[PDB]
Amino acid sequence: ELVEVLKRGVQQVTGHGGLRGLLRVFFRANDIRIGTLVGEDKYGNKYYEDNKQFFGRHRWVIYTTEMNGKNTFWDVDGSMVPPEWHRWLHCMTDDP
Amino acid sequence: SAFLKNAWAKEPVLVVSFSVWGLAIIMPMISPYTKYASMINKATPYNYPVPVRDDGNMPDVPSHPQDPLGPSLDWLKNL
Amino acid sequence: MWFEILPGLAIMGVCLVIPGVSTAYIHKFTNGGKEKRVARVQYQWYLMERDRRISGVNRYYVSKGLE
Amino acid sequence: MNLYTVIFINILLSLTLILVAFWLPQRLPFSMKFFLVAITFLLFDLEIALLLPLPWAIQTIKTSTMMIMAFILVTILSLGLAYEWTQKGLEW
Amino acid sequence: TYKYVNKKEQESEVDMKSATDNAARILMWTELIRGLGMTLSYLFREPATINYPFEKGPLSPRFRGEHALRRYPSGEERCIACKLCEAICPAQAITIEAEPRADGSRRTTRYDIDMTKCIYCGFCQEACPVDAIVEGPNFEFSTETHEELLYNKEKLLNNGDKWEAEIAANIQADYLYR
Amino acid sequence: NMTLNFGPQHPAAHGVLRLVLELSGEMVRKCDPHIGLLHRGTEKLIEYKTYLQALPYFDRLDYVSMMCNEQAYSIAVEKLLNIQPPPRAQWIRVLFGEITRILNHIMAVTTHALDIGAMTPFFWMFEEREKMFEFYERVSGARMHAAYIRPGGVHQDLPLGLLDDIYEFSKNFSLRIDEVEEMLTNNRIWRNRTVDIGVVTAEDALNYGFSGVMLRGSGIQWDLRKTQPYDVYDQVEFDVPIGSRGDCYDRYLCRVEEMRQSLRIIEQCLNKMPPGEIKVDDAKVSPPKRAEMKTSMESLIHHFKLYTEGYQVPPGATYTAIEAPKGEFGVYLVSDGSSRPYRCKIKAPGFAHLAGLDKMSKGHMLADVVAIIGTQDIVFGEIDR
Amino acid sequence: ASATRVIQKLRNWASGQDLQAKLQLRYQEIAKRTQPPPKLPVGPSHKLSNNYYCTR
Amino acid sequence: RSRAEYVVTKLDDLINWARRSSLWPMTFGLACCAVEMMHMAAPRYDMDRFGVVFRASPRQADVMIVAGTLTNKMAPALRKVYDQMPEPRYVVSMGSCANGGGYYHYSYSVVRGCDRIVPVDIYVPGCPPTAEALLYGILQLQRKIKREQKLKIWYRR
Amino acid sequence: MFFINILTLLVPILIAMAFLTLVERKILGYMQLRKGPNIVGPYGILQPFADAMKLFMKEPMRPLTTSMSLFIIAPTLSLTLALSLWVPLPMPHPLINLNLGILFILATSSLSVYSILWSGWASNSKYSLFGALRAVAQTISYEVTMAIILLSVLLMNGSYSLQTLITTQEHMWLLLPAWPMAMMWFISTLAETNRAPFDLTEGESELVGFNVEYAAGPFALFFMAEYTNIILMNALTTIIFLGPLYYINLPELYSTNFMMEALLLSSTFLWIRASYPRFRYDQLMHLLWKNFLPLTLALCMWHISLPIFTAGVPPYM
């Protein structure tokens, strides 16, 4: 029971790389959740999908560190996602 | 009585309100303990009990606190 | 999930126990390991004061049968 | 003194805030009902007073008189309330 | 067929049991406690919010979003300045003036969609015979200055080139329907 | 009397409302609502716009019931053209019309509570509302302001997954009404705030032209959906939720019932939607299909003329009323033979309701007025037009 | 969903309803995207015969 | 690092972060764009998460979102409410009705843009500008608020 | 050392004040199907500090028509009284134990009604004055039953000192007995902190009155005051009616349980807010003068009788 939830929690925390990775995700994406990388675009954005979660949150993008020169560590904006991968993120097309 | 009934179901606070007003106006009158309050509080010794001179004409007053004479609070004990 | 509300509550809680443990150990330090005497009525202040005079200047110091 | 120490820190903490707050940045509304309430309020507030010594008066040796007195006070004020209800008062 | 809401069919005469049940409802706020239970229940439900930058609310192919002008795969811009996109725009947003290009082809010298005037109806998407003007998927084009929102042919053609891959996929999915 | 205006910025004022209140103490003796803060000139602009390019305007008059609004213009223009929409389109308009009444009622019941002070009902239902817009967006491309219901028929066929998704929403939606049902229908605090407030007598409601849930709440039995069945409201079965007494509670209870009755109508529409075309096959009225205009000359000519010039509806005038979620929404469209209308008087259920505020809010406190506006479901787009 | 049974039981009770059966959040029940291509039906008036407009 | 310049860059970074993290918006509520934000306040796209107040009186509002047409009868008011907002204040114009006249541009009763009435910081486009789209616009305001360097300008002034 | 203690009581309480705000914005959230503030900082922990800094930086506005003292005295008084009332509270040991402690708490609360009156007069705009007059009335009315409910308690405690109740509640909470008043103390605690079911003092839909003309630093100080009170009154419920277990050998399990009960009852008024619509101005006074005051006055007499005829007169001292 409760142990299971704690267990999956550990998986999540330990999942995003070392503590460095977790902090990278914890502080800029504000979500420690692990999914399956569905691809990495040439800009650097990494896209993931967790079909187990609800429709709203089964597909997420972890934006890059630098796009077109600008640092995007903290100043992440949606448009960073490339037009090709925009529809996958918005569920316009179910195909990566 | 009938209103009483609806009153119990409509405006059911006043009913309870008055009921308590009365029950507090009755229990004191009829109770096996009411008398104790004036005693239990009377007994509580707050001010030093000054001793009286022994003219030697008093058999009621105990010459010593632990003597078998005088007032007792065994009523307070085992109350 | 609701568990995220916990972090905030925890910080509140820790910050509501400090005061109760703090006030109740800064008393047992200043008064020599003995709870600060509560002098509700004068008698108690008298006894307390009497204690001061009995030893040092502070009432917490307490002389015993060996005096 | 101990209280004085605490309180002045209390005012200081608040005056500090307002000061920084102002320094860091660098006609006929009347209803008798409202007046009436205020009045009732004190009539009740005074009664609260005549009722406040009851904790010390509980220990009074009389007891019978205590309760007889206290019950009369609470009952007569409540009747005052009763007439307040009966009259348009308390009906805003 | 009608239905009475809040109409008491009959006068249930108070029975002590009934009265008590009611009086208890007023005295011990029973129904109020019922309401608290409902909110406590959801507190335990999973929240429906999405991380906005990381996750995006789903939009299907017909989403109108932001205007773009497409080009033929060869590289010839699709618009042939028939100018009925201007005719059917409800807001008077699109302004088109044209002249025969040197090639001899028909093309628009100036195509200006005033996006602040546009109410994103999507009729222009509808009206175009060559389907040169399309409602592109992007909805995030908020701009610091009002002038940036006014769009000339070069911004729209550039918008078209950037989003052509998804626009083509979206039109691919919905053309049978149209 | 301490004149005080309920200024626009205040949240309870729906953004634009300047109710000049005369406060006889906290009791308010007179209200003189000053609307006009959102008059956009909707009906003088329509005269300069062709019949299709004026459809969009009708999605912005009441902005919380978009498609039902554009079903009144679509029925009017269709009458003046003696054309009728194809069978599938009429079911789709009834399917979308009830999704809009659920959408308006979630708007009206939850925002009323927001005004009274209950905040949670709004959040639970608003998530259920974006679920619904998605249905608009998936069928038209706009979350709201769709332009889907066209003067003849509807614009595009339903995507191939919408009816399954509408079933899943309707299947679980009733529990969601049940949940605010428990949280805001027996709370003594709601009942006290809503019961016996703004009672309107039956004859007074007819005389003031209330014509809506306000008409039905006081017991008058009138639904334009059963009395004068527009579209297919003759082939769907539902019960009008007539209230008995008229207090703002009976009107709330009626609005909650209509959401439930609309789920009954939505069920029937999914169960019985016919195979067919979504727009009438007269190229003169409804634009030719994309493939046809690109392969047949008669279709390009018909597409060019329809988009550039217009339907050119025959000269006449009609008043067509449909039961919009707020009440009777009617368009008096006067038409010369021209492709652009001559007059379009939008009867707004709301111009009549707001007039009633002074009579309905009689002997009432400043707080009661907040409930009185809430129970008229007034959106100032329709009133201001 | 994805709730430990106990939380679900508390949920169902506090609400008084089997909220699990009808969750608001959508999970793999919603129509998949890229539903198959649609071949829509052509209505009447597309006959190539006896279709005179004057008669319609 | 040690330089009066570095201390003044870091401290505005602090002042900018506070204003950026807690923007309390005040929505006039004109037309329908107010609904497309009532959806932002709602659960699918919470705004509070980002530090946005669902309802804030003018005197306690950092951002004014003008949603809907600004008629010539509400203009004199918008300016008042903008003028009565506390100094640090920003405006986000939502809707083609507000940023520009949109449908109703040529009307005699509609101001062709709120930019004519109140200075506008971010213009969010779309007839019902989508709710993510407003959320992107509010996030763009946060990017504009991060870039501002008020303390640096006072130091080198 | 005394100052150290002064700091230990005020600083932690103030920090707790801040995080209550955060907790109010997440528990209300999850109840309404939304995460609440988690993006600033980790899980929103830095969120309370963030708007505090935004509030103090924004320009404090002094309305053209405004007193400049009855305007700045009002938030100072509100924070000063609320933080002050934490001075004499048993946890289990009080910083400044006062023999007439509960009379101190009742009197200090009463003084806060002025701040509302002074701020309303100072603003010099109609919304403020109307709001203040109704507000003062609510607060004052909910003082008359608030006081009588305490007098019933005291008579079963024997003294006005809050420290005595730790010895009165060594065997059972005063909720078991006197539960009927707890409820009536809880509802009155909801009125006196102008929280939701009774938030007409400052209704938002009604008169968007107390802070109408108050922004930035003044807004914050009352603000802080309200939330600290929200805790204090809940804490008084957790000493007077829910008596945390006291062991003389280890004093902190008293504070540990005081921590737990205070947080849960503080959670309860958060839960009440989201769950209920706000009462009408007269509906609010109708409750106190009609529904509660007759119940309280009668149950007050029952608490002068229960002691005497049950020979249970409480021991003074």
Ligand SMILES: COC1=C(OC)C(=O)C(CC=C(C)C)=C(C)C1=O
């Ligand atoms: C549902 O009815 C309406 C509201 O009240 C609940 C409004 O608040 C508003 C505007 C409110 C704001 C401040 C977003 C509008 C436009 C409205 O239509």
Ligand code: SF4
């Ligand atoms: S319709 Fe298509 S092609 Fe004709 S002008 Fe407008 S855009 Fe260019």
Ligand code: SF4
């Ligand atoms: S912009 Fe489009 S949506 Fe926003 S108000 Fe003007 S019309 Fe309504």
